[PDB]
Design a protein around this motif. Structure first.
Motif, PDB file in Angstrom:
ATOM      1  N   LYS A 170      11.743  33.998 -42.986  1.00  0.00           N
ATOM      2  CA  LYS A 170      10.454  34.059 -43.668  1.00  0.00           C
ATOM      3  C   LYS A 170      10.454  33.213 -44.935  1.00  0.00           C
ATOM      4  O   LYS A 170       9.476  32.513 -45.224  1.00  0.00           O
ATOM      5  CB  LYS A 170      10.096  35.511 -43.990  1.00  0.00           C
ATOM      6  N   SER A 171      11.539  33.262 -45.705  1.00  0.00           N
ATOM      7  CA  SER A 171      11.626  32.570 -46.983  1.00  0.00           C
ATOM      8  C   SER A 171      12.395  31.256 -46.910  1.00  0.00           C
ATOM      9  O   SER A 171      12.586  30.609 -47.945  1.00  0.00           O
ATOM     10  CB  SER A 171      12.270  33.485 -48.030  1.00  0.00           C
ATOM     11  OG  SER A 171      13.539  33.943 -47.594  1.00  0.00           O
ATOM     12  N   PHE A 172      12.831  30.842 -45.722  1.00  0.00           N
ATOM     13  CA  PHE A 172      13.642  29.635 -45.572  1.00  0.00           C
ATOM     14  C   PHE A 172      12.783  28.407 -45.851  1.00  0.00           C
ATOM     15  O   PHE A 172      12.030  27.949 -44.990  1.00  0.00           O
ATOM     16  CB  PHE A 172      14.244  29.574 -44.173  1.00  0.00           C
ATOM     17  N   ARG A 173      12.898  27.863 -47.059  1.00  0.00           N
ATOM     18  CA  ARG A 173      12.173  26.665 -47.461  1.00  0.00           C
ATOM     19  C   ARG A 173      13.160  25.618 -47.955  1.00  0.00           C
ATOM     20  O   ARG A 173      14.130  25.945 -48.646  1.00  0.00           O
ATOM     21  CB  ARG A 173      11.144  26.977 -48.555  1.00  0.00           C
ATOM     22  N   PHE A 174      12.914  24.360 -47.600  1.00  0.00           N
ATOM     23  CA  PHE A 174      13.838  23.295 -47.964  1.00  0.00           C
ATOM     24  C   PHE A 174      13.106  21.963 -47.963  1.00  0.00           C
ATOM     25  O   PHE A 174      12.081  21.793 -47.297  1.00  0.00           O
ATOM     26  CB  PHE A 174      15.039  23.245 -47.014  1.00  0.00           C
ATOM     27  CG  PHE A 174      14.682  22.885 -45.598  1.00  0.00           C
ATOM     28  CD1 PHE A 174      14.148  23.833 -44.739  1.00  0.00           C
ATOM     29  CD2 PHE A 174      14.893  21.600 -45.121  1.00  0.00           C
ATOM     30  CE1 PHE A 174      13.824  23.505 -43.435  1.00  0.00           C
ATOM     31  CE2 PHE A 174      14.572  21.267 -43.818  1.00  0.00           C
ATOM     32  CZ  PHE A 174      14.037  22.221 -42.974  1.00  0.00           C
ATOM     33  N   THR A 175      13.658  21.017 -48.720  1.00  0.00           N
ATOM     34  CA  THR A 175      13.158  19.647 -48.757  1.00  0.00           C
ATOM     35  C   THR A 175      14.203  18.731 -48.138  1.00  0.00           C
ATOM     36  O   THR A 175      15.215  18.415 -48.784  1.00  0.00           O
ATOM     37  CB  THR A 175      12.844  19.217 -50.193  1.00  0.00           C
ATOM     38  OG1 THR A 175      11.840  20.082 -50.740  1.00  0.00           O
ATOM     39  CG2 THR A 175      12.336  17.783 -50.221  1.00  0.00           C
ATOM     40  N   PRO A 176      14.019  18.290 -46.897  1.00  0.00           N
ATOM     41  CA  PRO A 176      15.042  17.471 -46.241  1.00  0.00           C
ATOM     42  C   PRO A 176      15.091  16.066 -46.816  1.00  0.00           C
ATOM     43  O   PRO A 176      14.165  15.597 -47.480  1.00  0.00           O
ATOM     44  CB  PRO A 176      14.592  17.455 -44.777  1.00  0.00           C
ATOM     45  CG  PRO A 176      13.107  17.615 -44.856  1.00  0.00           C
ATOM     46  CD  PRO A 176      12.850  18.522 -46.031  1.00  0.00           C
ATOM     47  N   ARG A 177      16.202  15.389 -46.548  1.00  0.00           N
ATOM     48  CA  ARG A 177      16.387  14.024 -47.011  1.00  0.00           C
ATOM     49  C   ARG A 177      15.890  13.038 -45.962  1.00  0.00           C
ATOM     50  O   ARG A 177      16.000  13.273 -44.756  1.00  0.00           O
ATOM     51  CB  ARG A 177      17.856  13.754 -47.337  1.00  0.00           C
ATOM     52  CG  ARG A 177      18.787  13.772 -46.137  1.00  0.00           C
ATOM     53  CD  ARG A 177      20.233  13.812 -46.595  1.00  0.00           C
ATOM     54  NE  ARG A 177      20.546  15.067 -47.275  1.00  0.00           N
ATOM     55  CZ  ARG A 177      21.642  15.273 -47.998  1.00  0.00           C
ATOM     56  NH1 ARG A 177      22.530  14.303 -48.148  1.00  0.00           N
ATOM     57  NH2 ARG A 177      21.845  16.448 -48.578  1.00  0.00           N
ATOM     58  N   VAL A 178      15.335  11.930 -46.436  1.00  0.00           N
ATOM     59  CA  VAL A 178      14.759  10.908 -45.571  1.00  0.00           C
ATOM     60  C   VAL A 178      15.864   9.965 -45.112  1.00  0.00           C
ATOM     61  O   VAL A 178      16.682   9.513 -45.922  1.00  0.00           O
ATOM     62  CB  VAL A 178      13.644  10.142 -46.302  1.00  0.00           C
ATOM     63  CG1 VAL A 178      13.256   8.899 -45.527  1.00  0.00           C
ATOM     64  CG2 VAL A 178      12.439  11.046 -46.513  1.00  0.00           C
TER      65      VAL A 178
END
Ligand SMILES: O=C(O)c1ccnc2cc(-c3nc4ccccc4n3CCN3CCCCC3)sc12
Ligand SMILES: [Mn+2]
Length: 294
Positions: A56-64
């Motif tokens: 539910k809370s799994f948020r992330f900013t992946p790398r390009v």
């Protein structure tokens, strides 16, 4: 011509007796597996750990990742696990014009290496790599208190194959998470202190690996140094390992032994000390990995 798949690395299917402890099992398969650098371990069919991340809370900013960045010589989106999977599946189905599960693994492999060396097409993907298991929890159940462990999960919380229960101390670290999509990749590297690494694919589409045995480590480094651009050839290995992307056929043509495997959901991949490895993801998946010493 087109990509020639390297020979398959060893795959072990231990019985429940042999599956007692990873350290002893890795010690016994070592005479074969250390000669191939990487190996795959399929647990018994009934060994199925439940996914224990806080989805539910799994948020992330992946790398390009730009696949052909080395051949070319402004990129900087927060996702949830769900929204990343929707983006990942949409990308792959649109790219191959077919359902994601119908794309052959050999086709993704040949297309990945074509795009890596392609100067006409600029393909860009995203990789949720090196996400700390301390942030949103491990994929394995753990006796932590932050998440309730059901009775059916305690066996896996205490299992020696739970990556949180691996010995991580040398003589004189937490697991990391990887949310992959099609064509997301990791370049050739060895572990710090030449440590072992063990990698578990919790769910999703396969992760394709390439491995080189430790006895050919110097041979790989010389080939990598001979064919790397002059600006990166003199860089320290810890920094050069950030851009060490190389088609396995180029290493094989220079006499470097290379093995491959498709790591499917529920399977382990073990890399041996100083065994160079690289790879890419076939599609939306979720992996967990940790370094350990024996
Ligand atoms: O993608 C997989 O499944 C996979 C399988 C086996 N090895 C690896 C190594 C990977 C990797 N890409 C990087 C890009 C930039 C900088 C470091 C990178 N590293 C290694 C990260 N290392 C040190 C920091 C803390 C985490 C561990 S990704 C991966
Ligand atoms: Mn590694």
């Amino acid at each position: 011509a087109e990509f020639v798949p390297p020979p398959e690395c060893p795959v072990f299917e231990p019985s429940w007796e042999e599956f007692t402890d990873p350290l002893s099992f890795i010690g016994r398969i070592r005479p074969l597996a250390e000669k191939t650098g990487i190996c795959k371990i399929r647990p018994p069919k009934d060994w199925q750990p439940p996914f224990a991340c806080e989805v539910k809370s799994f948020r992330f900013t992946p790398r390009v990742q730009r696949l052909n960045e080395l051949e070319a010589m402004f990129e900087q989106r927060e996702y949830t696990l769900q929204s990343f999977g929707e983006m990942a599946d949409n990308f792959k189905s649109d790219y191959f014009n077919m359902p994601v599960h119908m794309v052959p693994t050999e086709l993704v492999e040949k297309e990945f290496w074509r795009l890596v060396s392609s100067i006409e097409e600029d393909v860009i993907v995203e990789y949720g790599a090196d996400i700390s298991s301390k942030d949103f929890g491990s994929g394995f159940p753990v006796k932590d208190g932050r998440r309730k462990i059901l009775p059916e999960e305690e066996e896996y919380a205490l299992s020696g194959w739970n990556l949180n229960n691996m010995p991580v101390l040398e003589q004189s670290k937490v697991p990391w998470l990887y949310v992959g999509m099609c064509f997301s990749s990791f370049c050739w590297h060895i572990e710090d202190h030449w440590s072992y690494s063990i990698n578990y694919l919790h769910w999703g589409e396969p992760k394709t690996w390439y491995g080189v045995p430790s006895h050919a480590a110097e041979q790989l480094e010389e080939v990598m140094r001979e064919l790397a651009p002059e600006l990166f050839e003199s860089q320290p290995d810890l920094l050069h390992q950030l851009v060490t992307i190389m088609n396995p056929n180029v290493l094989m043509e220079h006499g470097v032994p290379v093995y491959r495997t498709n790591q499917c959901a529920g399977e382990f991949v073990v890399t041996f000390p100083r065994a160079y490895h690289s790879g890419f993801n076939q599609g939306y998946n979720f992996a967990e990995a940790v370094n350990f010493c024996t």
